[PDB]
Amino acid sequence: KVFGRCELAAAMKRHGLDNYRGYSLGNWVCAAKFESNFNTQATNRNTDGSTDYGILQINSRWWCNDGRTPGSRNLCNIPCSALLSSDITASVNCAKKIVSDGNGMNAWVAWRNRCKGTDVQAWIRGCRL
Numbered sequence: 001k002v003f004g005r006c007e008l009a010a011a012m013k014r015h016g017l018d019n020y021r022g023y024s025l026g027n028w029v030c031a032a033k034f035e036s037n038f039n040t041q042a043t044n045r046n047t048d049g050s051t052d053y054g055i056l057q058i059n060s061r062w063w064c065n066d067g068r069t070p071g072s073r074n075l076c077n078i079p080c081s082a083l084l085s086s087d088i089t090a091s092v093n094c095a096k097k098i099v100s101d102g103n104g105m106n107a108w109v110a111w112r113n114r115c116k117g118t119d120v121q122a123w124i125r126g127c128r129l
């Protein structure tokens with residue numbers, strides 16, 4: 001499913017992401033915009049042979065199993081394909097583990113490149129939350 005911006009903002013708020021590990025909701029929405037374009041089925045291959053999966057582009061080296069990635073640790077204990085459903089729950093639950101691990105949101109490249117340090121509240125303005 002491709003979420004609308006405000007639709008995803010409400011869904012992320014419903015999943016308790018607002019200020020999760022201190023990251024305001026706008027951070028999460030901005031991350032999803034530039035990671036997946038709000039598309040729950042997005043997949044993108046990386047240089048190290050890993051692939052990023054779903055709405056938050058969770059990586060197959062450390063977080064989920066896709067059977068083709070070197071150095072696989074599968075820390076969310078899930079097939080990567082399970083992070084591609086229309087509901088954001090599995091992605092959120094894995095993201096909560098990732099963002100708690102010590103590096104915060106710096107795990108997400110598109111978030112670092114496009115969202116970090118910016119006025120991320122722009123991403124939730126005008127949304128019914």
Ligand SMILES: O=S(=O)(O)c1cc2c(O)c(c1)Cc1cc(S(=O)(=O)O)cc(c1O)Cc1cc(S(=O)(=O)O)cc(c1O)Cc1cc(S(=O)(=O)O)cc(c1O)C2
Nearest residue numbers: 001002003007008010011012014015085086087088089090
């Ligand atoms: O209409 S939507 O495009 O928003 C939609 C999104 C999702 C969907 O799975 C469905 C529709 C199909 C669907 C329809 C219905 S219906 O009302 O009978 O037509 C019911 C369900 C369903 O999956 C079952 C369902 C209901 C609810 S609740 O009504 O809000 O309690 C939640 C879910 C359900 O599967 C989980 C869910 C959450 C989310 S979230 O936006 O990430 O929270 C997205 C989708 C989900 O299926 C993903």
Ligand SMILES: O=S(=O)(O)c1cc2c(O)c(c1)Cc1cc(S(=O)(=O)O)cc(c1O)Cc1cc(S(=O)(=O)O)cc(c1O)Cc1cc(S(=O)(=O)O)cc(c1O)C2
Nearest residue numbers: 003004005006007008009010011123124125126127128129
């Ligand atoms: O987030 S959405 O993109 O889905 C959206 C839906 C609707 C919208 O009207 C708006 C956005 C714009 C909007 C945003 C805000 S904000 O909270 O400041 O971001 C406020 C309004 C508004 O129209 C004005 C408004 C206020 C209230 S209040 O709770 O009584 O203060 C209710 C409404 C408002 O329009 C009615 C309303 C509720 C809803 S809701 O999703 O059921 O809450 C959606 C839409 C509505 O027009 C229909």
